[PDB]
Amino acid sequence: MREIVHIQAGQCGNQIGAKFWEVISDEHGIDPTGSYHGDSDLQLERINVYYNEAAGNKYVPRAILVDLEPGTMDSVRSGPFGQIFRPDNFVFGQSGAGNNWAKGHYTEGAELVDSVLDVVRKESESCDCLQGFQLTHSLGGGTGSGMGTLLISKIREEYPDRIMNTFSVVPSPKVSDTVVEPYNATLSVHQLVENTDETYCIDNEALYDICFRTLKLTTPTYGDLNHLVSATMSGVTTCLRFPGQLNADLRKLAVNMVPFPRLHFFMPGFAPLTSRGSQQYRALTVPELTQQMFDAKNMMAACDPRHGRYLTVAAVFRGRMSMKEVDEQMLNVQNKNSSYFVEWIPNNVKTAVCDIPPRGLKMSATFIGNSTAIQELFKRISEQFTAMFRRKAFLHWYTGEGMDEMEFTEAESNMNDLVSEYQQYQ
Amino acid sequence: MREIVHIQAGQCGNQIGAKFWEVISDEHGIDPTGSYHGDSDLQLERINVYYNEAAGNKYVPRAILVDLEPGTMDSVRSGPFGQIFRPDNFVFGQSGAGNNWAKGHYTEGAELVDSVLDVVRKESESCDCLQGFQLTHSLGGGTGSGMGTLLISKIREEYPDRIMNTFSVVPSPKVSDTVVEPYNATLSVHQLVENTDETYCIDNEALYDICFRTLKLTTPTYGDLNHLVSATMSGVTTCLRFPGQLNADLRKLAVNMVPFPRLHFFMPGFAPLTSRGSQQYRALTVPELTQQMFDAKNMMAACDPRHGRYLTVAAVFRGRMSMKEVDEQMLNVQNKNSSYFVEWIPNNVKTAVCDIPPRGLKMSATFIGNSTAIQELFKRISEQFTAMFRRKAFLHWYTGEGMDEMEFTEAESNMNDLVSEYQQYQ
Amino acid sequence: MRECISIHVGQAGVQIGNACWELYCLEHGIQPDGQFNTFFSETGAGKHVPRAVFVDLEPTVIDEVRTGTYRQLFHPEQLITGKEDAANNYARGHYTIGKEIIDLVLDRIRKLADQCTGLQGFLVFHSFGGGTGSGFTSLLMERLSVDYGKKSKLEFSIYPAPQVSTAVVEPYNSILTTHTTLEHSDCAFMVDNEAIYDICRRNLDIERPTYTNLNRLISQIVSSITASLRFDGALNVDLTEFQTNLVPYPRIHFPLATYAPVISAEKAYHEQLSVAEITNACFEPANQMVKCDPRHGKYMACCLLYRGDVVPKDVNAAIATIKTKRTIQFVDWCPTGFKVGINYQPPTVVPGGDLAKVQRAVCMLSNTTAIAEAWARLDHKFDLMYAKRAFVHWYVGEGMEEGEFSEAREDMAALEKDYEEVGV
Amino acid sequence: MRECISIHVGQAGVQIGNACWELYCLEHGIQPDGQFNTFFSETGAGKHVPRAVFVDLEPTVIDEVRTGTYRQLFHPEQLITGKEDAANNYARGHYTIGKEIIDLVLDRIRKLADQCTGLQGFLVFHSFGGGTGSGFTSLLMERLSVDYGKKSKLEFSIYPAPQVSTAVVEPYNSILTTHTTLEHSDCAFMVDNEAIYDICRRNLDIERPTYTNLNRLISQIVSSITASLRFDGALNVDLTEFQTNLVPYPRIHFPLATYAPVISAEKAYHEQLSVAEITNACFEPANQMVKCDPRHGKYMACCLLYRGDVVPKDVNAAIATIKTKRTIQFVDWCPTGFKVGINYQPPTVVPGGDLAKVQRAVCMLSNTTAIAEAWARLDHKFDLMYAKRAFVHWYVGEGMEEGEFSEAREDMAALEKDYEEVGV
Ligand SMILES: CC[C@H](/C=C(/C)[C@@H]1C[C@@H](OC)C[C@H](O)C(C)(C)[C@@]2(O)O[C@@H](C[C@@H](OC)[C@H](O)C(=O)O1)C[C@@H](OC)[C@H]2O)CO
Ligand SMILES: Nc1nc2c(ncn2[C@@H]2O[C@H](COP(=O)(O)OP(=O)(O)OP(=O)(O)O)[C@@H](O)[C@H]2O)c(=O)[nH]1
Ligand SMILES: Nc1nc2c(ncn2[C@@H]2O[C@H](COP(=O)(O)OP(=O)(O)OP(=O)(O)O)[C@@H](O)[C@H]2O)c(=O)[nH]1
Ligand SMILES: Nc1nc2c(ncn2[C@@H]2O[C@H](COP(=O)(O)OP(=O)(O)O)[C@@H](O)[C@H]2O)c(=O)[nH]1
Ligand SMILES: Nc1nc2c(ncn2[C@@H]2O[C@H](COP(=O)(O)OP(=O)(O)O)[C@@H](O)[C@H]2O)c(=O)[nH]1
Ligand SMILES: [Mg+2]
Ligand SMILES: [Mg+2]
């Protein structure tokens, strides 16, 4: 029961996915050759949530790896845990996507998507009771954004009563990584508003801030950033894979975190994150962890949470702890600072607890916030997009693939509507 | 009881036959010198089905090797298992057949056929209870097609109450191997419609697809393709040679697979077929095997099975398995996708099971499908034939051997009637 | 076993034959002194002797052979001689001088046949245009037809080029040959010297060639054609299959013969030399071994003979690709327009030669309406010549009649019409 | 896999190509005798062969290549030759002499394409101003466009300098090229010799340079551009991405190419050579590889290709800093004006070279309204020349017409207007 199918699309999506599979593997005591070397029966009890068993006690992640160019996936295969994946689950094209949503969604991606869908169907048929799908991609490129969105559309059409959740890497206000980012992001976001149940919004600038300000890390690698993201990802599904006092679930989280269907864009966080120098200096108390969790500096989106209000927040705690303490802390936060929580939803904080903590920690926590502050990201994207579109700058690359102006206007309209909705509850 | 006499005719027929005899030999623990080196008593219990015993515990296949040219059979004799055959069972002529059905059926072949018949009679006289004959040939050439058909005619006339089954290699829609192929194939098929009880239709293009798409084989040899065919062939007669839970038989299969006498053209398949790279990645479950079996990509004919309906399918499973599971899987396929099975025959799938699996596998299966999609092959052949015949192209080579136009028209008529019949149940 | 007899007639034919025999010897390890059955008849002293007929009316070429390196190889009869050549005169071959020698040749052929337990038929080497190769060869062919009937009679013929020649009675002779080998020869494979020269210029990067090189090239093709009789391999082709597969109508039986890869040592390393590439090269207009554009003609039937390392899958793919090309036009009535032959034995390199060692080589035999143009050109030439009754006194002065020429022209016209019909 | 084909046209282009190939060999450990797939097509003897087209109408540069060190590396076809050069005459390239060779080139290109399982497109090396590099290249590009359509066609072009030149028909040719590669080439990357000399004078502290050094510098840039196809790294850029990111409107597609750090051994030790510093250097007016001040122009779109040791955080910081500067002006309509590419593989040092080993290097490709000024200058020059109908008899005497020039001028004016509009 409760099988989850993973899809990783494009460069960033595949890279983050590799790290995620490493982390999950280590959590379950699975080595790169698919052999189990754990010490606890809890490690295998719910291994089926992420893994499929093969002859000779081999475990193979239910992961589908998708790209329009072979490089990234060749690197992944060459990598440490790369040999753990099913070879038949690498689905790739030959021509690149040129950071072009239209190529991912309408042309190059359209040619490949049926093949991906077939693999997806095959995997879903092996599920006793499939919970849903997890997707990893970027919003600013062509493959993860265009192809990824397309895949989501297809799967929701075919499996409309399953959970569809994405970890989506978004552009950052200071330092864009591509010139057409606003166009791609807007085109993706338009589709995600209507075709996903929840989306975790990750901002690389926030990750860098975490690495520098919090972790005191002089020289963060993308690998290190990926690790953090993977940790957050693992947190979300912990309650499917292990016992607890309050057993959470994806669906439960959705129920408690989405008060209106379109408002499903979350700011993720993780705790504790402490510098290697200052480890003995910190006392690892639930209160202190809570404080870390709620600190804007420990968020992974391009928002100031203090510039908005929390509609709902879900906290998932890992390790041994007093439920009394947890509840009291939650009460204290809300009573003290009631202005930062929407007044029309009493008890804005939901708590879940899983007994088994991650490696190397006695306690940890994962934070998921639905804040009206997220509107700032959307507003900024919209401004950027309009700045370009009003001059039809770069547009020939998209019209050449058959897109029309009207689609862009529709996207803009959707964006603005979303922003307006967010402003309502602000 | 239940002796089977094998006839292999022409180049392809002899080549496939060599491989088949190798495979069967290894299954029965018989070495190339006719000595038994098996570990189980089950290996010898029904060895008489394919082999005849001689002085000094020598086993000699009941095989008759026929060609109008000596080259191919000289190669066969030179080959690994070539010395196992009875020297007196090589029957050959001196002049080639020039890819000419008329030479095989009416002229060169007519001169040799009596000699073959004498050998056949001799073999049949050594059978306590002869089940029937198995023939291997191509449809597109002169010897296997013309001579082979002729032999079939003769034997059916003499042994009309025995089983006559053929493994017939047919032309492929993309890449023909001879120019007169349509003529030869049509001339053969005309005779096979009326003189055989079942024909397994093999398409080399499908085999290449299997090798490249499924087995991931960069460089398939004809030897490798032959191996696959041999495996399928062995599957069919497994239940004569070994114990089981549901002991099948040739006649039983015919009874369940031929609802109208002329519709006896089957699409064969085999499972599992997995790449050497991705072996540990697959879990060898009966469900998964079933899925492989029913996958169009795992068929050996030039059909899209989804472009027609299955009249009946026979599945023969090899190894240890739960009958419960097998039955349930069969039910699931039919319930889920009832549109692909003719509605006037409830329980379109028949299952047989043999306890002893082939070498190197715990489980395997062989698939035999009577699908209305086969009409496409016939239709395409007919189109090709007519394209030539309406201009009397290449016809002098056949009229020169005494054939008349009327025969060709008759053949065309038969073909069209067959197609119409297939379309009825489509 | 499978056995065939070679016949080499003329100067050109004899030259070609020498090369062929050398190639054969290199292939099967036979020394020049005779120290396989398909071509070499074996005797009771560990000695292998060719199974060929060598005929010339001029005793010069034959004499050279008799004195040269491979003199001990050949029999003192197989090499037959005359006294005076035809001198570019069909009439002196077919009527006057040929009926002195022909009987002997026939006897020799019969003897050779007797020594075989399954004669597949004949391979004949002559030249359209030469005096002996035109008339004498025709005469021989007729006699063979009368005798054996249903034994394969394959011909290898040097077709006259359009823009170049070496004899100013070449249209007549060729026409006569065409007239009198239209109801006898089953296949007449074609090579053109100009085309070969062009190939040498282009692919080999050699622009100082000679007849020897050409002969060697021809021999390679011959070997490829005959490789299925002498070695193992998937899809073993026979001499009898060619007739079946390349002759849609009995008058239409002239297919072009081309070889790939014809390439030197320098760009053998640069090129991959995959199967598909080779196949593509085979169908390219410039690579063809005659002076005709196959863009101006529909392919009726083609035959491909892959020799060496070849995965049949690859070959199939190549064929599919070829079929796909718009584009390379085929006729409406022949959809299946391919025959495929494969051998495990690779090509063999001749010391002091043009060509380097290769993994895999391909020989293509194609029957097409492109040759119609060539035929028409030849006819036009003939018309231009015969309108003034030029040279006719030579031909008429040894047997021929005014009227025969007209008949020949009519026949040619009929052939052209047939070709046109086929084109539709 | 990811595969691209190089095309090198002219003298200058060929020179550049030699350097490039040397660099490639140094990178991938290939010996000069051929003993990767992205650039080197691999054959069945442990031999690696470049996947390039080398074209020259004058047989001199090509001959040099054929005799020199890397002769065994290249194929005997990839290196193509003619008989007489255009002689600074667009008309003799585009119309008269080019249509003799172009077919062969096309065929070669097709062959190369066939040998690939995912052709990303083309890299072409020519020169605005030269006779062959102007007209012939244009012709080739048009043909490519006609054929492939949606295969990337990137150009590397030597732009004529304002205050210096080596040919007094250089305005015409360049203008013609611009006219006839405005509706074909997707990107045309720019380098200027005067700028390079200035750079050498300033940063390297070398004031006795030669063409070889320039070529090497260009090759470095090329390598940087193409490093993402051949090595691993975060943010692997593709040839198809450049088009998407640097071309806001289809006519506007000339971006400048600059490299940092271009520095000698002496002040490599003095400098820290951090990421931020390098980034700053990239945007400095004097360090640019053309004769234009980017202070007199707004940056539309920029692309940065970091190669070696780079913490992406540092890169981000640098970019932020750049954005902060008042400045370095960007257009109103392009806020996100940066593309970032990173490779783990560092730069590679060429023996007997100008540059020392570095930890990290950066290549910047920037599309800006600064080039408008240059274009205007060129136009003015053209006007000055064409007003008296100087040299026109040479061009008109081989194909061209009076009127074409006018059309070209009009096109240039339109381009200028577009640039002006963009500026607003
Ligand atoms: C029942 C008779 C039968 C008809 C059908 C449609 C059957 C049913 C199912 O198999 C039993 C399909 C199956 O459940 C899958 C979805 C897992 C899957 O195998 O489907 C194919 C495509 C499908 O045709 C669409 C296939 O070719 C096929 O034959 O499907 C892609 C494949 O990629 C891995 C995978 O996605 C014909 O004999
Ligand atoms: N390829 C090739 N062609 C040849 C050779 N010898 C002659 N030819 C060609 O054959 C034609 C001339 O015919 P020959 O065979 O020389 O004449 P012949 O058969 O001896 O007849 P006469 O000499 O007329 O009695 C010309 O087209 C020559 O180019 C040769 O060794 N190789
Ligand atoms: N950087 C660099 N520039 C070169 C080189 N060779 C020539 N140039 C420049 O290219 C321009 C001249 O064009 P070339 O390429 O020499 O001319 P071409 O293409 O051979 O054309 P024709 O000689 O006119 O047929 C001048 O601006 C030269 O400075 C070189 O090796 N490196
Ligand atoms: N966090 C993170 N971001 C990445 C990674 N790789 C690329 N990116 C970011 O993803 C965006 C670029 O999209 P990318 O996935 O490479 O393009 P695609 O292959 O077309 O989907 C940029 O915002 C990059 O900063 C990674 O491994 N980790
Ligand atoms: N699968 C397979 N097909 C073959 C083999 N040999 C020949 N063929 C095929 O058989 C057909 C040619 O007929 P063939 O048996 O060689 O002619 P025959 O000797 O006149 O009967 C073609 O479709 C070939 O592709 C073989 O060993 N295996
Ligand atoms: Mg002579
Ligand atoms: Mg030059």
Rg, C-alpha atoms of chain C: 21
Q: How far is CA D282 from CA D215, D221, D277, D291, D365, in A?
A: 20, 13, 9, 15, 10
A window 96-115, beta carbon within 8 A of D: 96-100
Q: How far is CA A273 from CA A300, A330, B56, in A?
A: 12, 20, 81
Length of chain D: 424
Is B260-373's fold the same as B374-426's? no
Residue nearest to atom 7 of ligand 1 (CA): B295
Verify whether residue C241 is a known catalytic residue. yes
Q: How far is Cα B366 from Cα B267, in angstroms, rounded to an integer?
A: 11
Return the residue matching tokens 């003719």.
B342
DSSP three-state, residue D155: strand
Burial of D266 (0-12, 13-18, 19+ CB in 10 A): exposed
Contact residues, chain C to chain D, C-beta under 8 Å: 205, 266-267, 269-273, 277, 280, 359
Neighbours of C113 (CB within 10 A): 17
Q: How far is Cα A18 from Cα A81, in angstroms, rounded to an integer?
A: 7
Instruction: Give the 3-state DSSP-derived string for C169-227, with helices as H, strands as E and coil as C.
Output: CHHHHHHHHHHHCCCCCCEEEEECHHHHHHHHHHHHCCCCCCHHHHHHHHHHHHHHHHH
List the single residue in C229, C244, C316 with the smallest CB-CB distance to B175. Answer: C316
Q: Does C334 contact chain B (CB < 8 Å)?
A: yes
Cα A378 → chain centroid: 17
User: How far apart are the CA of D316 and the nearest CA of chain A, in angstroms?
Assistant: 6
Provide the CATH topology of domain B374-426: Helix Hairpins (1.10.287)
Q: How far is Cα B20 from Cα B167, in angstroms, rounded to an integer?
A: 11
D203 in Cβ contact with D171 (< 8 Å): no
Burial of A173 (0-12, 13-18, 19+ CB in 10 A): middle
State whether B278 and A53 contact (CB < 8 Å): no
Provide the CATH topology of domain C256-370: 60s Ribosomal Protein L30; Chain: A; (3.30.1330)
**B284 to chain A: which residues are within 8 Å by CB?**
55
Between the CA of C403 and the centroid of ligand 6 the distance, in Å, is 27
Chains adjacent to C (≥3 CB pairs closer than 8 angstroms): B, D
Cα–Cα nearest to C224, from C263, C188, C260: C260
Q: How far is Cα C376 from Cα C407, in angstroms, rounded to an integer?
A: 16
Residue ranges covered by each domain of chain A: 1-259, 260-373, 374-426
Number of DSSP helices (H) and strands (E) in chain A, helices first: 15, 13
Known binder of ligand: residue A334?
no
Residue nearest to atom 32 of ligand 2 (CA): C12
Q: Does C338 contact chain B (CB < 8 Å)?
A: yes
Tokens for D219, please give them.
Answer: 């090759």
Query: In CATH, which of 3.20.20.70, 3.30.1330.20, 3.30.70.100, 3.50.50.60 is domain A260-373?
Result: 3.30.1330.20
Known binder of ligand: residue A11?
yes
| Active-site pick, D64, D142, D241, D373 | D241
Cα–Cα nearest to D99, from D407, D399, D413, D414: D399
Q: How far is Cα C387 from Cα C380, in angstroms, rounded to an integer?
A: 11
Q: How far is Cα D86 from Cα A210, in angstroms, rounded to an integer?
A: 62
**Cβ of residue D17 lying under 6 Å from some atom of ligand 3:** no
Query: In CATH, which of 3.40.50.1440, 3.10.310.10, 3.10.110.10, 3.40.50.1820 is domain A1-259?
Result: 3.40.50.1440
Tokens for A275, please give them.
Answer: 């510098």
B window 324-383, beta carbon within 8 A of C: 383
D339 in Cβ contact with D237 (< 8 Å): yes
**Cβ of residue A119 lying under 6 Å from some atom of ligand 1:** yes
Q: Which residues line ligand 2 (CB under 6 A)?
A: C 10-12, 15-16, 57, 85-88, 127, 129-133, 158, 160, 166, 193, 211, 214-215
**Cβ of residue B341 lying under 6 Å from some atom of ligand 1:** no
**A86 to chain B: which residues are within 8 Å by CB?**
278, 281
Q: How far is Cα A18 from Cα B253, in angstroms, rounded to an integer?
A: 50
Does domain D1-255 bear CATH number 3.40.50.1440? yes
**Cβ of residue A126 lying under 6 Å from some atom of ligand 1:** no
Provide the CATH topology of domain C371-424: Helix Hairpins (1.10.287)
State whether C323 and B177 contact (CB < 8 Å): no
C309 in Cβ contact with C359 (< 8 Å): yes
Written as one letter, the residue type at D273 is L
Q: C194-199, long-range: CB within 8 Å, 24+ apart, which pairs? A: C194/C161, C194/C162, C194/C163, C194/C164, C194/C291, C195/C161, C195/C288, C195/C289, C195/C290, C195/C291, C196/C289, C198/C286, C199/C262, C199/C286, C199/C287, C199/C289
DSSP summary character for residue B394: T
State whether D76 and C205 contact (CB < 8 Å): yes
**Cβ of residue D10 lying under 6 Å from some atom of ligand 3:** yes
Written as one letter, the residue type at C53 is V
Cα–Cα nearest to C239, from C157, C346, C107, C341: C341
Known binder of ligand: residue B43?
no
**Cβ of residue A64 lying under 6 Å from some atom of ligand 1:** no
DSSP three-state, residue A176: coil
Tokens for C194, please give them.
Answer: 């100009």
Non-local CB neighbours of C338 within 8 Å, separated by 6+ positions: B175, B176, B177, B178, B179, C302, C303, C304, C319
DSSP E strands, A17-73: 51-54, 58-61, 63-67
Q: Ligand 3 pocket test: pick from D8, D9, D11, D124 the residue with the most ligand atoms within 8 Å of its Cβ.
A: D11
Written as one letter, the residue type at C44 is G
Q: Resolution of the experimental model in angstroms, please?
A: 3.5
Q: Does C359 contact chain B (CB < 8 Å)?
A: no
A142 in Cβ contact with A68 (< 8 Å): yes
Tokens for B83, please give them.
Answer: 């010395």
C257 in Cβ contact with C251 (< 8 Å): no
State whether C269 and D115 contact (CB < 8 Å): no
Q: How far is CA A318 from CA A23, A202, A332, A366, in A?
A: 16, 22, 20, 8
D346 in Cβ contact with D231 (< 8 Å): no
Neighbours of C204 (CB within 10 A): 19
Tokens for B403, please give them.
Answer: 């054939």
**Cβ of residue B206 lying under 6 Å from some atom of ligand 5:** no
Q: How far is Cα B255 from Cα B253, in angstroms, rounded to an integer?
A: 5
**Cβ of residue B296 lying under 6 Å from some atom of ligand 1:** yes
D55 in Cβ contact with D136 (< 8 Å): yes
**D235 to chain A: which residues are within 8 Å by CB?**
11, 177
Q: How far is Cα B112 from Cα B91, in angstroms, rounded to an integer?
A: 8
Q: How far is Cα C316 from Cα A133, in angstroms, rounded to an integer?
A: 41
Q: Does C280 contact chain B (CB < 8 Å)?
A: no
Residue ranges covered by each domain of chain C: 1-255, 256-370, 371-424
Ligand in nearest proximity to the CA of C131: 2
Return the residue matching tokens 């047939």.
C418
Cα–Cα nearest to A267, from A370, A134, A418: A370
Burial of B339 (0-12, 13-18, 19+ CB in 10 A): exposed
Cα–Cα nearest to C157, from C185, C198, C197: C185
Residue nearest to atom 6 of ligand 4 (CA): A12
Burial of D44 (0-12, 13-18, 19+ CB in 10 A): exposed
B window 55-84, beta carbon within 8 A of C: 69-72, 75, 78
Q: At what angle do helices A181-195 and A405-425 cross, to 10 degrees?
A: 70
Q: Ligand 5 pocket test: pick from B169, B202, B381, B397 the residue with the most ligand atoms within 8 Å of its Cβ.
A: B169
